[PDB]
Design an enzyme around this catalytic site. Sequence first.
Site, PDB file in Angstrom:
ATOM      1  N   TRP A 100      -8.967   6.753  -0.123  1.00  0.00           N
ATOM      2  CA  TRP A 100      -9.320   7.465  -1.351  1.00  0.00           C
ATOM      3  C   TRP A 100      -8.406   6.985  -2.471  1.00  0.00           C
ATOM      4  O   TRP A 100      -7.379   6.344  -2.238  1.00  0.00           O
ATOM      5  CB  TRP A 100      -9.220   8.993  -1.210  1.00  0.00           C
ATOM      6  CG  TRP A 100      -7.927   9.428  -0.636  1.00  0.00           C
ATOM      7  CD1 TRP A 100      -6.753   9.642  -1.305  1.00  0.00           C
ATOM      8  CD2 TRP A 100      -7.655   9.655   0.740  1.00  0.00           C
ATOM      9  NE1 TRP A 100      -5.765  10.005  -0.420  1.00  0.00           N
ATOM     10  CE2 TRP A 100      -6.296  10.018   0.843  1.00  0.00           C
ATOM     11  CE3 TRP A 100      -8.422   9.572   1.902  1.00  0.00           C
ATOM     12  CZ2 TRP A 100      -5.695  10.309   2.063  1.00  0.00           C
ATOM     13  CZ3 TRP A 100      -7.831   9.875   3.108  1.00  0.00           C
ATOM     14  CH2 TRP A 100      -6.480  10.240   3.180  1.00  0.00           C
ATOM     15  N   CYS A 160       0.848  -1.190   0.000  1.00  0.00           N
ATOM     16  CA  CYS A 160       0.000   0.000   0.000  1.00  0.00           C
ATOM     17  C   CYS A 160       0.881   1.236   0.000  1.00  0.00           C
ATOM     18  O   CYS A 160       1.682   1.430   0.922  1.00  0.00           O
ATOM     19  CB  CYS A 160      -0.952   0.023   1.202  1.00  0.00           C
ATOM     20  SG  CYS A 160      -1.968   1.547   1.344  1.00  0.00           S
TER      21      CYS A 160
END
Lengths: 419, 414
Positions: free
Chosen positions: B284, B112
Site C-alpha cells: 500500500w 523499502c
Amino acid sequence: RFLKVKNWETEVVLTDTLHLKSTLETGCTEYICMGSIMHPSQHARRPEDVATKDQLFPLAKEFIDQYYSSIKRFGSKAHMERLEEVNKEIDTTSTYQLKDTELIYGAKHAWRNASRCVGRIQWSKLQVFDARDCTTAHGMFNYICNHVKYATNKGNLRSAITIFPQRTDGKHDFRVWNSQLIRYAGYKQPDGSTLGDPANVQFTEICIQQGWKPPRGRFDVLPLLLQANGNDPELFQIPPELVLEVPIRHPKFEWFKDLGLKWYGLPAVSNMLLEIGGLEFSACPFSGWYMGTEIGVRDYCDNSRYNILEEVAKKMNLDMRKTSSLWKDQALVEINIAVLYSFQSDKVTIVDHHSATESFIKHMENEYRCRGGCPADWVWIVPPMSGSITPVFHQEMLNYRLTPSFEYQPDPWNTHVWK
Amino acid sequence: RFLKVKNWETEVVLTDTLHLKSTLETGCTEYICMGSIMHPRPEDVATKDQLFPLAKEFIDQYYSSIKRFGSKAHMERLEEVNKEIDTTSTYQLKDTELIYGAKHAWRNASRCVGRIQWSKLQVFDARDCTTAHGMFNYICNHVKYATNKGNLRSAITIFPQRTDGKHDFRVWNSQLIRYAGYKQPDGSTLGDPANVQFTEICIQQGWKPPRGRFDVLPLLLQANGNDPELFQIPPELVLEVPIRHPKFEWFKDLGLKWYGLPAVSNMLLEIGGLEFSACPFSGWYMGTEIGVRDYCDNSRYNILEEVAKKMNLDMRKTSSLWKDQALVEINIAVLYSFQSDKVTIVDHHSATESFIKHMENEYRCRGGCPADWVWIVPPMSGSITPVFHQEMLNYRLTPSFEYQPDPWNTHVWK
Ligand code: HEM
Ligand code: HEM
Ligand SMILES: Cc1cc(N)nc(-c2cc(CNCCF)cc(F)c2F)c1
Ligand SMILES: Cc1cc(N)nc(-c2cc(CNCCF)cc(F)c2F)c1
Ligand SMILES: C[C@H](O)[C@H](O)[C@H]1CNc2nc(N)[nH]c(=O)c2N1
Ligand SMILES: C[C@H](O)[C@H](O)[C@H]1CNc2nc(N)[nH]c(=O)c2N1
Ligand SMILES: [Zn+2]
C-alpha cells in the site's frame, strides 16, 4: 575508470575524472556503503603526533606541487626552491610554514573540497585572516572579534576564515572550544526539562563550571572558551554590539512575534580542523551566511533542539491528535516562511533552500566543465524539508575526499589535561 | 568484524554483524562513494559452475532459517539440486523455498521503508503459466486479492523463472496500475508524463486510447519470449480514490484521483541464482509517493503552480515558500481522501517510525538490516521524521529484487 553522474530531471550527464586525485578512504567498500554514517573513516594523512620526515615531507611535496601547478608553474625555479625550503625546514624544526599565498590557496580549496557544503559556488570569494602570530587566549579573542565584525558587515555578510597557529606537538594546540562562535546556552532545569538550546547543555555547563555567570534565559549568547598554545581555556564575552540578531516575526501571523524567538545572523563554525600539506590548523573558525532551513528546520524543529513545533502548531489551531493531519509539516513551513521574512526585512543576508540548491547545481556544472568533477555528499546537500521539490534531490553525486580539507576533531575537553 | 550505527537524535547504537554475509557489489569503491547513484545481457544467464555455489548458499540459508541445518532433509535437498543443475543445467525451487525466497528479497530490499510488514507477504506461485492469457488471469486474481475492497494486502505473483534468456516472461508495464500520458502537438502533456513512451507502445500495439487525463493503462504481457499482448484490467478491479481536501472546498475541482494499489512489475526477483524476470508485487501507499512525487515533480503531474494559485500564494519569489506550502496541503488531501474511502494508506511519519522500530528489531534478532538513507528518508519534511537522524549501513543480501532493462530495448520481435 571514469564516472558519469546524471540528473533525472534534466537527463544531463556529467563526466567525473577529478575523483582519481582522491587520497583518503570514504569508509565504503565494494560490499558496504557508509554514505549516511556521520564519521565513516578515520583515515588520516599523518600519524598521531609529531611526524618523522618521511611522514610529513611527502604530504608537503604534494601540496606545494599542487599549488605551483595551479598557477602554471611546476618545475619553475620558485617551485624547486620552495621544495628545498620546506625540506630543510622539516629537517631543522620538524615542521614547515606556509607562504601567505599558499595559505590562502589551501583555505579556499578546503572550502571548495567540502563535499557537504551546498554554498561552495562562492568558494573563491573568501577572506582569509592570517593569525599565525597569535600567542594568547586574549589575542585569540581580539582576532575572533575582528572576524565577527568584518564578516557581519552590518548585516550584509561576507565569507571569512581566521587561521590560528598550526599544531606542533599536540600538547600546544590552539582550540576554540565553542562549536560555533555565536550559539545560545542551554540550561538543565530542576524538573528534568531543558531551557535554551539542548545541544549546548554540556558546553553551557563547562562555561558555568569555568566561572561563567549564566543569565539563564532562552537566548543567552554563550561566552567564548579560547585555548592557546596548549594552556587552560579562558572565558571571554563577545561584545553584544558585535552579535547581530534577527527577531522572528511572520508576514501574516501577527501572533508570531509573541512566540518570543530570535536567532543570530552569523554562522561561524569553529570546532573543525583545517588540513593543508600535512599541517594541522586546529583552530580555524569560518563563517558565511545561513540557509534558512538551518535555523527554521533543524534549529527550531529537531527534537533535541528548540522543538517549538507543537507550540507553533497549537497557535495555528492544528489537528495534533494523529500524524496524518501533517500538522508538524504545516507549522514547519510557516516557521521557515517566518525566518526568511525576518532576515530579509532586517536586510540580513540569508538564502532560501530553493535558490541555494539551484545555485549548487550551477556550481556542479562549472566544476565538472573546468575541473573534471566536484565532490558532493547527497545526504547533506539535500535540504531537510521539501527535498524532492529542489533540484539537488534529482541530481546524482559522487563523493570522494580531496586535500586540502576541513576535518572533524575530538572535542578538546575529552583530551585536555588541566593545571 | 563489527560495525556500529548511531542514532543522532536518541544516541541509540546498534551493532551490525549481518553485513559480513553479503557478497554483491554496492558500486562504492574504497575511495569513492556512489550512494546517490540510482543504478551503479540476456545471454548472461548462469552457467552450471556459476549456479552450484549460489544454490548451495540459498539452500543452506533456508535450512538454517528453519532449524534444520546439516539435517538429513538438508543434505538430500542439496544433492537433489546438484543433480538438476548437472542434468537440466538449472533447478526448481520447492514451494516452501519460493515463499521464503520472496519474503527475504523484500526483507533485504534496502530502499523499502515498509519492511516491518515483510513476513506477512502472500506469494502466488504462477510458475505453471505458459501464455500471456494465463498471465493476465494470474495478475487479475493478484489485483483482486491485494485490493481486498480497500483493505489492502501485500502480495507477489511469481511467473516462470528465466531459462536461456530467450524465453523470458515479462510484465512490460512498470506498475500494474498506471495512468497514460499523451504528448500534445503543442508541446503540452496530457495525463502522466512518465508513461508517455509506454503509452506510445501500447497504442502502436493496438490500444484505442480514451485520450483523457486518468486512463488506466492496458497490461502488456509477454510469456516465453513471445511478442507481448494487450489486456484491459476489468475496471471493476481497479480501485481509485478521488482526491478532495478537508478544508478547501475548491480542491475537488482540481479533478484529481489516484489508484489505490502500488504494484511494481518491472523488477527481477533473484533466489538461489535463479532469475524470475516477471514477479509483480504490491503493498500500500505512503502518502508522499502520490503527494510529493506523482503530483509535484516537474517531470510528473506538476500541479504545484495550479494549487498555489487557488491558494492565492505569492508566486513571484521563491523565498515566499509557496511551493513548500502548497506541497503540504496536497499531501494532507491525499491522506484525507484515502482515509475517507477506507483505502489503506500510511503517512510519512507513521511509516518512518515503524521502520525505526523494524530496524532495531532486525538488529536484535538478525544482526543487521541493510538500508538506503537516500531512499528511506521521505521526499518532504525530512529532518522531522526520525529516520533522518538514523545512520544506516547499506549492503546487498540475496535473495534480492533487482532492476532489469526495459523489455522494448532488448526484445526481438517475432
Ligand atoms: C557562504 C555561504 C554558505 C552556505 C549557504 C553554506 C551552507 C552549508 C550548509 C547548509 C551546510 C550543512 C551543515 C549543517 O546543516 O549542519 C554546510 C556545511 C559545511 N560548510 Fe558550508 N556554507 C557556506 C559557507 C561556507 C564557508 C565559507 C566554508 C569554509 C570556509 C564552509 C564550509 C563548510 C563545511 C566544511 C561544511 C561541513 C560541515 C560539517 O561537516 O560539519 N561553508 N554548509
Ligand atoms: C506494505 C507496505 C509498503 C510500503 C508502505 C512501501 C513503501 C515504499 C516506498 C515509499 C518506496 C520508495 C519507492 C519510490 O519512491 O520510488 C519503496 C521501495 C521499495 N519497495 Fe516497498 N513498500 C511496501 C511494500 C513492499 C512489498 C510488498 C515489496 C516486495 C514484495 C516491496 C519492495 C520494495 C522495493 C524492492 C523497493 C525499492 C524500489 C527500487 O529499488 O526501485 N515493498 N517502498
Ligand atoms: C560556514 C557555514 C555556513 C552555513 N550557512 N552554515 C554553517 C554551519 C555548519 C555546521 C557544521 N555542521 C555540523 C556541526 F554540528 C553547523 C551549523 F550550525 C552551521 F550553521 C556553516
Ligand atoms: C510495493 C510498493 C509499495 C509502495 N508503497 N510503493 C511502491 C513503488 C515502488 C516503486 C519503485 N521505485 C523505482 C521506480 F521509480 C515505484 C512506485 F511508483 C511505487 F509506488 C511499491
Ligand atoms: C539521484 C538521486 O539518487 C535520486 O533522485 C533518488 C533520491 N532518492 C529517492 N528516493 C525515493 N524513494 N525515490 C526516488 O526516486 C529517489 N530518487
Ligand atoms: C545520519 C545522518 O548522516 C545525519 O542525521 C545527517 C543527515 N544529513 C544531514 N545533512 C545536513 N546538512 N546536516 C546534518 O546535520 C545532517 N545530519
Ligand atoms: Zn558509499
